[PDB]
Structures are given as C-alpha cells and as structure tokens.
Scaffold this active site. Structure first.
Site, PDB file in Angstrom:
ATOM      1  N   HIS A   1       6.571 -30.502   5.105  1.00 26.44           N
ATOM      2  CA  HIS A   1       7.078 -29.133   5.092  1.00 26.44           C
ATOM      3  C   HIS A   1       8.501 -29.048   5.640  1.00 26.44           C
ATOM      4  O   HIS A   1       9.093 -27.963   5.623  1.00 26.44           O
ATOM      5  CB  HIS A   1       6.096 -28.158   5.743  1.00 26.44           C
ATOM      6  CG  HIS A   1       5.978 -28.250   7.208  1.00 26.44           C
ATOM      7  ND1 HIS A   1       4.948 -28.986   7.761  1.00 26.44           N
ATOM      8  CD2 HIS A   1       6.683 -27.736   8.233  1.00 26.44           C
ATOM      9  CE1 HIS A   1       5.044 -28.926   9.074  1.00 26.44           C
ATOM     10  NE2 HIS A   1       6.091 -28.184   9.389  1.00 26.44           N
TER      11      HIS A   1
ATOM     12  N   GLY B   1       9.783 -26.485  16.536  1.00 22.67           N
ATOM     13  CA  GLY B   1      10.547 -27.721  16.605  1.00 22.67           C
ATOM     14  C   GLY B   1       9.692 -28.950  16.922  1.00 22.67           C
ATOM     15  O   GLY B   1      10.188 -30.066  16.806  1.00 22.67           O
TER      16      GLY B   1
ATOM     17  N   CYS C   1       6.964 -30.076  15.384  1.00 19.47           N
ATOM     18  CA  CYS C   1       6.376 -30.750  14.236  1.00 19.47           C
ATOM     19  C   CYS C   1       7.012 -32.121  14.055  1.00 19.47           C
ATOM     20  O   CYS C   1       8.228 -32.247  14.172  1.00 19.47           O
ATOM     21  CB  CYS C   1       6.531 -29.990  12.925  1.00 19.47           C
ATOM     22  SG  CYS C   1       5.516 -28.501  12.926  1.00 19.47           S
TER      23      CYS C   1
HETATM   24  C1  LIG Z   1       6.426 -26.891  12.712  1.00 17.65           C
HETATM   25  O1  LIG Z   1       6.695 -26.417  11.384  1.00 17.65           O
HETATM   26  C2  LIG Z   1       7.774 -27.066  13.407  1.00 17.65           C
HETATM   27  O2  LIG Z   1       7.809 -27.497  14.537  1.00 17.65           O
HETATM   28  N1  LIG Z   1       8.883 -26.770  12.742  1.00 17.65           N
HETATM   29  C3  LIG Z   1       9.178 -26.277  11.391  1.00 17.65           C
HETATM   30  C4  LIG Z   1      10.666 -26.515  11.687  1.00 17.65           C
HETATM   31  C5  LIG Z   1      10.289 -26.894  13.135  1.00 17.65           C
HETATM   32  C6  LIG Z   1       5.573 -25.850  13.470  1.00 17.65           C
HETATM   33  C7  LIG Z   1       5.173 -26.223  14.904  1.00 17.65           C
HETATM   34  N2  LIG Z   1       4.600 -25.085  15.640  1.00 17.65           N
HETATM   35  C8  LIG Z   1       5.486 -23.916  15.886  1.00 17.65           C
HETATM   36  C9  LIG Z   1       4.661 -22.672  15.992  1.00 17.65           C
HETATM   37  C10 LIG Z   1       3.719 -22.780  17.072  1.00 17.65           C
HETATM   38  C11 LIG Z   1       2.839 -24.002  16.935  1.00 17.65           C
HETATM   39  C12 LIG Z   1       3.338 -25.139  16.071  1.00 17.65           C
HETATM   40  O3  LIG Z   1       2.595 -26.063  15.734  1.00 17.65           O
HETATM   41  N3  LIG Z   1       4.395 -25.619  12.638  1.00 17.65           N
HETATM   42  C13 LIG Z   1       4.256 -24.513  11.903  1.00 17.65           C
HETATM   43  O4  LIG Z   1       4.960 -23.530  12.103  1.00 17.65           O
HETATM   44  C14 LIG Z   1       3.191 -24.557  10.817  1.00 17.65           C
HETATM   45  C15 LIG Z   1       3.821 -24.776   9.446  1.00 17.65           C
HETATM   46  C16 LIG Z   1       3.644 -23.522   8.637  1.00 17.65           C
HETATM   47  C17 LIG Z   1       2.835 -22.543   9.449  1.00 17.65           C
HETATM   48  N4  LIG Z   1       2.499 -23.288  10.680  1.00 17.65           N
HETATM   49  C18 LIG Z   1       1.676 -22.878  11.639  1.00 17.65           C
HETATM   50  O5  LIG Z   1       1.431 -23.572  12.603  1.00 17.65           O
HETATM   51  C19 LIG Z   1       1.168 -21.445  11.537  1.00 17.65           C
HETATM   52  N5  LIG Z   1      -0.283 -21.533  11.488  1.00 17.65           N
HETATM   53  C20 LIG Z   1      -0.987 -21.081  10.467  1.00 17.65           C
HETATM   54  O6  LIG Z   1      -0.570 -20.465   9.507  1.00 17.65           O
HETATM   55  C21 LIG Z   1      -2.477 -21.380  10.554  1.00 17.65           C
HETATM   56  F1  LIG Z   1      -2.841 -22.465   9.881  1.00 17.65           F
HETATM   57  F2  LIG Z   1      -2.822 -21.719  11.767  1.00 17.65           F
HETATM   58  F3  LIG Z   1      -3.144 -20.253  10.311  1.00 17.65           F
HETATM   59  C22 LIG Z   1       1.694 -20.508  12.653  1.00 17.65           C
HETATM   60  C23 LIG Z   1       1.238 -20.910  14.064  1.00 17.65           C
HETATM   61  C24 LIG Z   1       3.226 -20.532  12.585  1.00 17.65           C
HETATM   62  C25 LIG Z   1       1.186 -19.092  12.341  1.00 17.65           C
HETATM   63  C26 LIG Z   1       2.955 -24.794   8.210  1.00 17.65           C
HETATM   64  C27 LIG Z   1       1.446 -24.758   8.269  1.00 17.65           C
HETATM   65  C28 LIG Z   1       3.485 -25.581   7.022  1.00 17.65           C
END
Ligand SMILES: *[C@](O)(C(=O)N1CCC1)[C@H](CN1CCCCC1=O)NC(=O)[C@@H]1[C@@H]2[C@H](CN1C(=O)[C@@H](NC(=O)C(F)(F)F)C(C)(C)C)C2(C)C
Ligand SMILES: *[C@](O)(C(=O)N1CCC1)[C@H](CN1CCCCC1=O)NC(=O)[C@@H]1[C@@H]2[C@H](CN1C(=O)[C@@H](NC(=O)C(F)(F)F)C(C)(C)C)C2(C)C
Ligand SMILES: [Cl-]
Lengths: 306, 306
Positions: A41, A143, A145
């Site tokens: 992603h 950040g 991920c």
């Molecule tokens: C990850 O994408 C990241 O670190 N970055 C993208 C550029 C830097 C990020 C890491 N992260 C930040 C939010 C709090 C917890 C966390 O793990 N991961 C994401 O944002 C993923 C990404 C999108 C949506 N996502 C989620 O974790 C979301 N969760 C969901 O939609 C659900 F599955 F849990 F319902 C949110 C927590 C943002 C709502 C991917 C799944 C592709």
C-alpha cells in the site's frame, strides 16, 4: 533473578531499515541483500486505500517512482514485483549489513520482537505474541507500516511479521515476509473484525514456572490432574486446549523446577475456579499468557545472541 | 495506537560490549574510545567478594592480568585505574563503533533501557525505572554484571547504569558510569536492605494520560483538586509528593489531551480512595508507575533515534 518482558537486541535489524517513498506515501522497508521489502500500500494515495486495486496501481509505476533512502544514501531501484501483500524492490546495492536471516511464518501463541520504525528510523523495541485470533497487541502510529517482527537464533534473524494495519478494536494485523496476512484480513481501509480471542494456556503455565523459579510459590498445591480433566475445566474460562505437544514443550521447565506439568495444571485449575484471592504472581494481579516456554528458559537460564 | 513498555533500539550499545576476564572471573565491559569500563569486582575471587579490599587486590594486578575480548579479537590492555566502584582499562585500540555518548547520573523516577549481556554478548533488552529507594526491578543472572543501562537522544547514547548486584529482596543495584552507586549500597556480598519503596506519582499520572489517549476513559470525573489537597490524600497510600515541577513536566500531555493536570489528579485521588471497582486501565488491574511523561510522549507521538 527477576523476570521481565524482554525483546531481542535489535542491532542486526536496525541496519536493515530504510525509508521507502512512492509519490507522497512514505513508509518503512527492510533491505536484505539487494532487495527491499515493504507493504504494497506504499503505492496508494489515502483515497486509494479505501478500496485499492494494487495490480492496477503498480502497472502505472516504474522503478523510478520508488525513492528508497538509507540515511544519507539514495538507492537506485532497478526492478519491482509484488508478492501477495508485499512489494519487492530490486536495488543496485546489496546491503553490506545484511545479517544471516530466514523468513518464517509463526504459529498462534509464539512471540517475537517488534522494531517500531518511522521514516526508516528505529524508535523502540518490544515483545508481542501472535494471538489465537491472528492479531497482535502492539504500538503503531502513522508511519510505522513496514516495521518488522523477528526472533534471533544465535546469529540468525528469523523475520516473521511486517506491520500493515490496525483493526477497529485497537489491535494490529500484518503479514509474513512473503506478504501473506496472518488471519482473514485484507489491506483495505474497511471495517473488519478479529475472531474473539482465547488465552494461550501453555504460555500461562510457562509463566507459572517462571514465577516458581523466582520464588513466588503460594499457588502451588499438593494435587495432580489428568490432561483431560484440566482441559474440561479450562475450556469454560476460554483457555485454549492443552495438547500433549504442549506438555512435551514444557518438559524443560518441569525438569528445572522438579514440578510435573500436571502438578502445575492442578494449580492453574484452582486459580481459574477460585480466583487469585487478593494476591499477585510476579507482581501481576492477572494471569499472563505472552511468554512462551522458550522465552522463560531463555530468560531464566541466560541464552545470548551473538 | 496502543501502548507498550518499549526499550530504545540497542544497536549502538551492542557494538560497545566486550568480555572482560581477570583470573577466572569473567564479566561484561563497555568499550568506548580506547577505554573499557567494568565492575571492579572483576578482580575478586568469589571468596574475596565476601569482604573485599579492592585497592589491595588491584596493586597485585598488572595490565596483562586483564583479558579483554571483542568477538574474535583480543584487545591488549595498556593501563588501568579504579574510579569508585568501576575499573577503567586503557586499551591499544579505540572502538571504531563508539557512538556519540555521555555519562549521566539519573534521578529516582527516571527510566532507561537495559541491555542484559552474558560473556560480552547481548541477550535481551528491557525498560527499568530507578525506584525512589535507588533500586531497579530487572532480570540479571550470573555473568550479567557490567550490563549497562541507557537512554538515546537522537544519535547520542546517555549511559546511566552499570549492573553490580542483587539485594535480599530480589531487586537490583548498580552504579553510574563513574562508579558511584545509586543508593547506600556497597559492592560486598553481605546482607544489605533497600529503603521501603514509594510509588512514582508523576509516572502514574503520565500513564493515566496514555490511557486516555488510547481510549480508556471510564475513570475520568468532572472534578478538579488543588495540588495541596491531592498530596494530603495520596501521602497515605505511600505515593510520593507531586511538586509543581512535576505538574510542569506533565503539561505537554495535558495540552495534547485537553485534560488539566489537576483534573487528572482528581481522577487519581478517587482511584486511590475507592479502588478500581473490578475494572482495568490499559489492560492492567494495578496502577503502573514505570512510564515517565517523556516515555508517554515518545510512544504516543512517534519520536525516533537515528
Ligand atoms: C500504515 O499505512 C502507515 O504507517 N503508513 C501509510 C503511510 C505511513 C498505517 C499504520 N497505522 C497508522 C494508523 C494507526 C495504526 C497503524 O497501523 N496503516 C494504515 O493506516 C492501514 C492502511 C489502510 C488503512 N489502515 C488501517 O490501519 C485502518 N484500519 C482499518 O481500516 C481496519 F482494517 F482496521 F478497519 C485505520 C486504523 C487507519 C482506520 C490500509 C489497511 C491499507
Ligand atoms: C556479578 O558479579 C556477575 O554477573 N558476575 C561475577 C562474575 C559474573 C553478579 C550478577 N548477579 C548474579 C547473581 C544473581 C544476581 C546478580 O546480580 N553479582 C553478584 O554476584 C554480586 C557481587 C557479589 C555478591 N553479589 C550479589 O549480587 C549478592 N548480593 C548480596 O550479597 C546482597 F547485596 F544483595 F546482599 C548475591 C545475589 C550473589 C547474594 C558482589 C556484591 C561484589
Ligand atoms: Cl496487572
């Protein structure tokens, strides 16, 4: 003596972390040999992430769209392919700090260290267990991920987790380093639910042994039990079944302490039925299920990791 | 989101650990520049340690009595002196992996990471707090002496602890890197007692903020209090006094969450009087006092350590 939640030393992994950017999405990658591995992603905008077509996003990208940085050095990308939910970037430079390593897919109930990173830079290290519902209870901000989970075996890093996301309950989900998720989760921003969790029985017994080793012995009783009769009682408290395999794995603790596994099971049975009666074990008022038998032996015998 | 006890990444320290042997006593040293620092009881036999005269043991030793090994390489010692309870060995080779570093003496209530080592080799990493009674609750077996405690500040390692011993209660005591003990302990194998401990109030408040940040908010009430009235109540539960300095230090958490420090103190006051009423906070049934306000900001804002 003493018992603490302990992470593996992180140096070998610290020298493999890089920052990967594609467009204006930036996350972490792991640089081993001439390959960087990161969550796929990284090719999404945040709008794409609501419902992504990764194959369609990736065709539109070429090698030059990926900026990979290691400290001051940019690494030129010279190839790319997607493996499940992970992106492999071939680079022009092999990492000279690559440790001996393997990729491993861990089982529910097994522990690992997480090196939480932001912008390719290590922030901290902690221990997690893979829950029976295939989630972990970590600590991950935006950040993070691409942060990885790992075990060390003498000189060899076994990589077992790469962080992708967080579920509506606040727990965390990710992939092995071949890009296969643990559990039935997908890398899409949509509501998804984990199975209800269960307690890792073999790990609670290994913690009870740690406790005895460290002098906390009030919960020890004069009774034994059968595996069958223990599992009947424990089942109702949402403890996972204890198998003969688990009994065998606990054998080293058993021999170190001279307390048979089924003697300890008889103690645990009474703790579940009667409660902890206003007492603690190793300072804790709750039973702890995130130490494996190996974690206990490692910490209460002194094994190190050149 | 999520909140975990997190250690600093250990790589910078891992490349400073060596094995020091004198006679048939072997422990860990820290190699910075052309100096190795280790506990002075490396010169004792185990019988000497019952009642040592270090000055008298040291005169009998010359440079060649000290075997210092870094992996495969022996380092020739070319000078020695004792500073308080630490031994400084000058060596013929400067450590090329020496990080930017400082020596610091920490205050009661401050946290650090411990890199537990055996035979110069890193085994694991965990977080400890310096207790108000100047002990730590670590995990240390035979061979662990010379393991160090540290904080990282961007690129700079602040070394603050070197492990020496364990007290009759199972807690741990050591020195700063100038060889001065924390608390009134001596490096001799004889019965010694720590003061009774107290709870680090500012750290419990910082954990309550972490909890709010992570969505655990049931303990929040509509009341405020005065610093004076909070300290009167808390005193009786063996909480240390909260000073205006501590209030100032909590200010960043306060601003991030929009909950005034004295609003949170009013919540903590009710938790101490009434109990937790069969509820947990961040998964814990007990109040936790080993996260500093900085630890919370670090973890719940995302600060990293090149
Ligand atoms: C990850 O994408 C990241 O670190 N970055 C993208 C550029 C830097 C990020 C890491 N992260 C930040 C939010 C709090 C917890 C966390 O793990 N991961 C994401 O944002 C993923 C990404 C999108 C949506 N996502 C989620 O974790 C979301 N969760 C969901 O939609 C659900 F599955 F849990 F319902 C949110 C927590 C943002 C709502 C991917 C799944 C592709
Ligand atoms: C440390 O000496 C070490 O690692 N080595 C010596 C060669 C390798 C050792 C580390 N250690 C091992 C025992 C369990 C906990 C621990 O910290 N430290 C010691 O053995 C010190 C050392 C002797 C006695 N000592 C103690 O820790 C002892 N404590 C005490 O006598 C008391 F202060 F707590 F009462 C024992 C735990 C061994 C009884 C020095 C104080 C110089
Ligand atoms: Cl608890």
């Amino acid at each position: 003596s003493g018992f603490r939640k302990m992470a593996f030393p992180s140096g070998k992994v610290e020298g493999c972390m890089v920052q990967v950017t594609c467009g204006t999405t930036t996350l972490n990658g792991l640089w081993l040999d001439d390959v960087v591995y990161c969550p796929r992603h990284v090719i999404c905008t945040s709008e794409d992430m609501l419902n992504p077509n990764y194959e369609d996003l990736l065709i539109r990208k070429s090698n030059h769209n990926f900026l990979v940085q290691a400290g001051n050095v940019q690494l030129r990308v010279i190839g790319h392919s997607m493996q499940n939910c992970v992106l492999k970037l071939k680079v022009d430079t092999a990492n000279p700090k690559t440790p001996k390593y393997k990729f491993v897919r861990i089982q529910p109930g097994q522990t690992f260290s997480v090196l939480a990173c932001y912008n390719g830079s290590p922030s901290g290290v902690y221990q997690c267990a893979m829950r029976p519902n295939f989630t972990i209870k970590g600590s991950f901000l935006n950040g993070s991920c691409g942060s990885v989970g790992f075990n060390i075996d003498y000189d060899c890093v076994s990589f077992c987790y790469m962080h992708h996301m967080e579920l509506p309950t606040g727990v965390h989900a990710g992939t092995d380093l071949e890009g296969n998720f643990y559990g039935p989760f997908v890398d899409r921003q949509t509501a998804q639910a984990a199975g209800t969790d269960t307690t890792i029985t073999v790990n609670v017994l290994a913690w009870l042994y740690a406790a005895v080793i460290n002098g906390d012995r009030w919960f020890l009783n004069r009774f034994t039990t059968t595996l069958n009769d223990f599992n009947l009682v424990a089942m109702k408290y949402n403890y996972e079944p204890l198998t003969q395999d688990h009994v065998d794995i606990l054998g080293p603790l058993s021999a170190q302490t001279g307390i048979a596994v089924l003697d300890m099971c008889a103690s645990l049975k009474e703790l579940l039925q009667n409660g902890m009666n206003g007492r603690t074990i190793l300072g804790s008022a709750l039973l702890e299920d995130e130490f494996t038998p190996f974690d206990v032996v490692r910490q209460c015998s002194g094994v190190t990791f050149q």
